[PDB]
Design a protein around this ligand. Sequence first.
Ligand SMILES: [Cl-]
Ligand SMILES: [Cl-]
Lengths: 181, 171, 61, 55
Amino acid sequence: LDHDLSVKKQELIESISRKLQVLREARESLLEDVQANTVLGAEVEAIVKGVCKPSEFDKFRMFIGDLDKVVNLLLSLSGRLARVENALNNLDDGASPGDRQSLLEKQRVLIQQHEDAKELKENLDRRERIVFDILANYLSEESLADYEHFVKMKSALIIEQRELEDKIHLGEEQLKCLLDS
Amino acid sequence: DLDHDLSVKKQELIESISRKLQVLREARESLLEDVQANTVLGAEVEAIVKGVCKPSEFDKFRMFIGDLDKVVNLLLSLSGRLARVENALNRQSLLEKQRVLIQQHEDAKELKENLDRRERIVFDILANYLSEESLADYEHFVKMKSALIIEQRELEDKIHLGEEQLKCLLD
Amino acid sequence: NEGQMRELQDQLEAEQYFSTLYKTQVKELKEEIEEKNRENLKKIQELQNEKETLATQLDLA
Amino acid sequence: GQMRELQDQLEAEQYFSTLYKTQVKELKEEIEEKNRENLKKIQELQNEKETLATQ
Ligand SMILES: [Cl-]
Ligand SMILES: [Cl-]
C-alpha cells in the first residue's frame, strides 16, 4: 500500500507545481497589462495638463494618488483582518481566554478601521464624480472614454495583481511544506 | 590598592542616586495627588457645561478636550524619539528617519495651532455661558491638565532612567 | 532586536495620534461648513428682503 | 518574528493619516473658495441695493 501513497504524493506535487507555473505565466502577462495601462495613464495626464487649469490638475493628480493609496490600504487591512479571522477560527479550544479576548479585540479594531476606510471610499468616489464632471467639459469624448477606462483599470488591476500574488504565495508554501516530507 | 578608591567611589555614587531617586518618587506621589484632584475638578466643570451649554457647542468642547490629551502626548512621544535619534549621534539609514521625524514634528506643530484655535473658540463660547468663577475653574482646569501630563511624563522618564542606572550598576 | 520593536511601537502610536486628530479636525470642518453655509443663507435672505422693501417704493414714485 | 505584522499595522495607519490630511486640505481650500464666492455675491447684491437706494 505504501507505493500507492508515495505515488499519490508525487501526483499531488506535480499538479500543484503545474498550477504554480501557470500562475507565474499569468503574472507575466498581467504585468505587461499593467505596463500598458500605465502608459495610457501617462498619456491622459499629458492631455489634461494642457486643458486643465492648475487647481483642476492638482485635484486630478491628488485624486489618483489617493486612489492608489486607498486601494492598497483596503487590501492590506482586509488582509490582516482575514488572517486574524482564520487564526481565531482554527484556534484550539480552551488554551487561554485572555488570548481569545486579545484576538477578538484585534477583530474589533480592524473592523472599525474597515468602516472608516469605507467612509473614505465614499468621499473618494465623490472626488471622482467631481473631476469627471469638470473634465467632461474640457476634453473630447474619445479621450474621455480612454481616461475612464484607465482610472477603473488601475484599481481593478492592482487588486487582481495582489490577489494573484497571494494565491501563488500560498501554493508555493503548501508545496514547500509538502516537499519537506 | 587603588581598587579600594574606585570601590568607595562607586558606593558613594550609588548612595547618591538612591537618594535622588527617592526624592523623585515622593515628588511623583504629590503630583499624583494633583492629577486626582484636578481630574475630579474636571468632572465638575463637565457637569456645569452639561447643564448650561448647548449639545452642539458641548460636542465641540468634548472634541477639544479629547484632542488635547492626544496632541500633548503626541508631542511628548515625538520630541522623545527625536531626542533619541539626535543623541544617537553621540550605515546612514538613520538620516532618513531623522528627516521623516522633523517633517512629522512640523505637521504636529500645525495640529497644535489648530488646537489652540479651538481653545480660543471654546473660551469665547464659554465666557458668555458661565460665571466668572466657573470660568476660572474651566481655564485653570484645561491648562492644569495640559501642563500636568507633561510634568508627569518628564518625571516618569527621569525616574525610569535613575532606576536603570541604579540597577545596572548594582549588578 | 528589541529596540526595533519598541521604536516601531512608538511610531505606530505617533501615526495613530496623527490619524485621529486629522479625523476630528475633518469632522469639525464639515460641521463648520454646514453652519456657515446656513447662517450665510439666512443673511442673504434678509438682505434680499430689505432690497425688496426698498424696491417696492420706487414702483409708486 | 511576528513584528512584521506590526509593521503592516503601521503602514495602515500611515495610509489613514495621509488620506485624512489630504481631505483636510481639500476642505480648507473648499472653505476659502466658497467663502470668497459668497463675499462676491453679497457684495454684488449689496451694490444693487445701493443703486436702488440713491433713488
Ligand atoms: Cl482609525
Ligand atoms: Cl505624517
